[PDB]
């Protein structure tokens, strides 16, 4: 609703537009692993659940496009949501947004055919999402809470779950312990976006997101070695042929003149904040009129925002399979050309892509690899 006066470099934050979702059964880890990108089991061993407290993935269409967005938490812990047991095979609680929190269960509940899976939404009294940020770091399982670090990038943060209730003092004690200000949800937003990393169906548009635009390949939510799931194939064809050209990355909407956390204010640009470009897939241009789009608007808040930017147009960074090697065998650094902005503004409002640090060191990876 509001905007961030001013940037948090840390903070804890009430997940509200996150929602839980119970997956269990005897098939759930066999279910569940032909049905989103990550890995379900272990390395080495295609039976033994994964016991890490908490990782990223995401369901895909058949079509290969994002679906939902999510983060899975095995679930094996004596955990009361399962207020009497059915199951003792595996349970799973998948992290969704709240709005796609039904859709995802009917979606769970559709597919399932003969597979012995049980699923049905986790009431946010029951189990609460939060998030909490600090450069120094933190990340777990102690009795009330689930801590497990945010691994899409290095300064994202850590998940928190909330097991007691609303009435409970778990997360104040633990915001009082690890000297975080308790912030509403959009100062949680901001540090998402200051990281690059955009999340929800309001980001990732449902069924039509593009994993690799949507940097999943970079974000740690695409086992690339695991076997078949749903939408694998476009996945796959993309990682080993593709030539991605357009990512998601940090913008500064600015006038003519974590990084980018320093840059943010809550002041209009020409518009009064970044909220208000079109809800979604506004077009970025060149100043000049030459060659129109550039750039999809995604969601913004203060003078930053996501967008899908043409990386060979808007940045610095060396595209995987097309950037030529120099002497030394690194890429050749091209220099980014002019100035951009909206379509149709012809006012001194300018967008900049700023490339995460994170983001350009594994681009760097890709990049090397592809080029072997």
């Given at each position: 609703p509001s905007i961030p006066s001013s940037y948090a470099p840390s903070g804890i934050s009430h997940l509200l537009s996150r929602q839980l979702v119970v997956v269990y059964g005897p098939d759930a880890a066999k279910y569940l692993q032909g049905m989103?990108?990550?890995?379900v089991y272990m390395p080495g061993s295609g039976s033994m659940v994964r016991t890490d407290r908490g990782y990223y993935a995401a369901l895909l269409t058949?079509?290969?496009?994002?679906?939902y967005d999510v983060f899975i938490y095995p679930l094996t812990d004596s955990?009361?949501?399962?207020?009497?047991?059915?199951?003792a095979g595996a349970a799973f609680l998948i992290e969704v947004d709240k709005d796609q929190a039904g859709l995802l269960v009917d979606h769970i509940k559709r597919y399932r055919?003969?597979?012995k899976v049980k699923v049905k939404v986790v009431d946010v009294e029951e189990v609460a999402v939060w998030h909490a940020w600090d450069p120094n770091g933190l990340g777990a399982s102690v009795n009330d809470l689930l801590v497990t670090p945010?691994?899409?990038?290095?300064?994202?943060g850590s998940r928190i779950l909330h097991f007691?209730?609303?009435?409970?003092?778990a997360i104040q004690n633990f915001a009082e312990r690890c000297q975080l200000q308790v912030l509403p949800q959009e100062y949680y937003v901001l540090h998402r976006i200051t990281q690059g990393v955009p999340e929800g169906q309001t980001e990732?548009?449902?069924?039509?997101?593009?994993p690799h635009e949507s940097n999943l390949d970079l974000m740690?939510?695409?086992?690339?070695?695991k076997g078949c799931y749903v939408g694998q194939e476009l996945v796959t064809r993309t990682e080993h042929r593709g030539v991605v050209r357009k990512r998601v990355l940090p913008c500064v909407v600015y006038e003519g003149s974590g990084d980018l956390g320093g840059l943010y204010?809550?002041?209009?640009?020409?518009?009064?904040?970044?909220?208000?470009?079109?809800?979604?897939e506004t077009n970025i241009v060149r100043v000049s009129g030459k060659?129109?789009?550039v750039g999809k608007w995604l969601r913004g808040i203060g003078n930053v925002g996501l967008a899908v930017c043409r990386l060979d147009v808007m940045t610095d960074l060396p595209i995987p399979g097309e950037t030529p090697a120099g002497e030394d065998g690194v890429p050749e650094v091209r220099e980014v050309k002019g100035e951009f902005t909206i379509?149709?503004?012809?006012?001194?409002l300018r967008i900049k892509a700023v490339p995460p640090a994170w983001l350009r060191r594994e681009l760097m990876e890709k990049w090397e690899v592809k080029n072997e």
């Open positions: 989103v990108t990550a890995n058949g079509q290969g496009r994002v679906l955990k009361h949501l399962q207020r009497v047991l059915p199951s055919v003969r597979a945010d691994c899409r990038t290095p300064a994202m007691g209730g609303p009435d409970g003092n990732l548009l449902k069924m039509s997101a593009i740690g939510g695409i086992d690339f070695r204010t809550d002041r209009p640009i020409a518009g009064l904040s970044s909220a208000r470009e079109i809800a979604s060659g129109r789009g379509e149709g503004d012809e006012g001194p």
